[PDB]
């Protein structure tokens, strides 16, 4: 679900939050985390979303 407060369950990272689109670009890497270890921004392969 997009841009709504929902129960996310992602690659062994689970919780509640609101997802948002971003237009960044990186030929490698799929997930990007915070200093504390939580993951904010990420991409998916087939579409680079």
């Amino acid at each position: 679900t997009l841009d709504v407060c929902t129960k996310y369950t992602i690659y062994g990272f689970k919780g509640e939050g609101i997802i948002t689109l971003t237009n960044s670009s990186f030929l490698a890497g799929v997930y990007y985390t915070s200093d504390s270890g939580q993951l904010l921004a990420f991409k998916n392969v087939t579409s680079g979303a």
Binding site: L27, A28, G29, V30
Partner: protein, 50 residues
């Protein structure tokens, strides 16, 4: 890019998609003939060291 080590593990563009056991040797084959060298299966390969 794909990189493999003597331990046999492989990184997909430096990611490490899949894990394997110890690989001793590998045999590779593709369109690399000499003419398609610019557009061959791979581009550059090297024996790299830590």
């Amino acid at each position: 890019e794909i990189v493999i080590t003597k331990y046999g593990d492989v990184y997909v563009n430096g990611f490490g998609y899949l894990h394997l056991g110890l690989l001793d040797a590998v045999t590779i084959n593709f369109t690399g003939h000499g003419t398609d060298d610019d557009v061959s299966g791979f581009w550059t390969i090297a024996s790299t060291n830590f």
